[PDB]
Amino acid sequence: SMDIDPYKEFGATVELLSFLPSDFFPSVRDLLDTAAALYRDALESPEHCSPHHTALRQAILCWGDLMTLATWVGTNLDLVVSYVNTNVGLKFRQLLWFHISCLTFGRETVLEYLVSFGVWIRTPPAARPPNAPILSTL
Amino acid sequence: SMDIDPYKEFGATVELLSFLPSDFFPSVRDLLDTAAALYRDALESPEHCSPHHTALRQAILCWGDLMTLATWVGTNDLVVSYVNTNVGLKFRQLLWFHISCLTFGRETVLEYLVSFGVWIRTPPAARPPNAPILSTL
Ligand SMILES: Cn1cnc(COC(=O)N[C@H]2CCc3c2cn(C)c3C(=O)Nc2ccc(F)c(Cl)c2)n1
Numbered sequence: 001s002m003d004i005d006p007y008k009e010f011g012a013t014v015e016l017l018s019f020l021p022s023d024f025f026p027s028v029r030d031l032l033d034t035a036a037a038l039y040r041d042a043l044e045s046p047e048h049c050s051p052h053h054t055a056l057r058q059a060i061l062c063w064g065d066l067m068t069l070a071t072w073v074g075t076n077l078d079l080v081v082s083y084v085n086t087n088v089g090l091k092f093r094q095l096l097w098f099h100i101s102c103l104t105f106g107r108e109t110v111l112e113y114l115v116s117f118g119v120w121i122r123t124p125p126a127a128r129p130p131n132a133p134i135l136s137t138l
Numbered sequence: 139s140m141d142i143d144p145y146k147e148f149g150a151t152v153e154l155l156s157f158l159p160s161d162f163f164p165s166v167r168d169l170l171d172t173a174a175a176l177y178r179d180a181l182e183s184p185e186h187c188s189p190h191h192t193a194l195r196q197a198i199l200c201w202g203d204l205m206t207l208a209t210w211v212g213t214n215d216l217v218v219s220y221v222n223t224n225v226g227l228k229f230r231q232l233l234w235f236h237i238s239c240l241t242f243g244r245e246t247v248l249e250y251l252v253s254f255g256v257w258i259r260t261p262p263a264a265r266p267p268n269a270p271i272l273s274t275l
């Protein structure tokens with residue numbers, strides 16, 4: 001009945017993030033470790049902090065639930081715990097990455113970088129500079 | 139790992155919502171139909187609107203993913219049963235909390251949470267016949 005874009009309120013879209021190839025995204029394991037190492041005080045906080053903070057909280061907690069289900073399938077039975085890493089994995093990797101990068105580097109900067117990298121990675125190797133464009137706050 | 143309370147930033151807690159019995163919560167089916175019927179324009183909006191709006195969006199989309207997984211398991215009995223038992227309650231709590239916070243007002247939904255839990259726990263013979271009422275006035 002409804003069609004909601006997790007990214008739309010943050011000035012992007014599901015299509016735009018599917019621009020970046022699936023192998024550009026860190027692991028889930030590494031993305032949660034990074035949110036923890038950088039933002040645990042703020043994520044666990046009893047303040048909104050920012051809309052990015054709100055969204056990321058739910059994303060982390062949701063990944064929890066999806067994994068609790070996958071674990072519960074394993075302790076009540078292989079191809080199921082495989083499906084998550086294939087399809088939902090990319091989804092949360094995109095979403096965790098977007099929000100962490102938006103808090104670290106700045107939303108506006110992460111949006112430029114999204115197109116920057118997608119254009120470059122799509123340029124064939126022999127014609128493109130040897131290194132990607134760089135994501136930074138300075 | 140980390141320990142995050144979806145409700146904490148909204149002035150409540152996971153414990154507090156587990157106060158209300160599981161059969162007090164509308165269905166998921168009915169909760170999404172209600173968010174749609176009341177908030178579709180705002181939820182689909184490209185504006186934050188409110189922190190409640192942000193959280194609810196993610197909750198709805200997440201329930202989507204959890205069900206897509208359960209459907210994909212079925213098209214590949216007790217698995218699609220587990221979701222309605224354990225995660226179902228979780229999303230019913232969370233969808234209800236956020237919709238009720240947008241409709242009636244956060245502060246009002248927090249009072250009502252304790253109000254109802256105290257009353258439902260009072261034995262029948264001693265408690266008024268009707269629950270306390272959740273409303274805007
Ligand atoms: C020559 N120069 C000038 N300034 C800088 C600093 O910039 C980088 O090296 N950027 C690295 C660091 C993080 C990063 C980099 C490149 N990309 C594509 C990323 C990235 O966004 N990774 C990332 C982002 C968010 C995350 F949560 C995790 Cl786990 C990883 N170099």
Ligand SMILES: Cn1cnc(COC(=O)N[C@H]2CCc3c2cn(C)c3C(=O)Nc2ccc(F)c(Cl)c2)n1
Nearest residue numbers: 164168169172173233234237238241271272273274
């Ligand atoms: C002066 N006065 C007398 N009556 C009223 C209106 O109040 C109720 O009838 N309350 C009912 C209607 C909705 C409701 C009621 C009691 N509870 C616990 C709820 C409720 O929270 N329902 C609800 C809330 C959010 C939802 F998303 C859905 Cl699907 C349902 N005002």
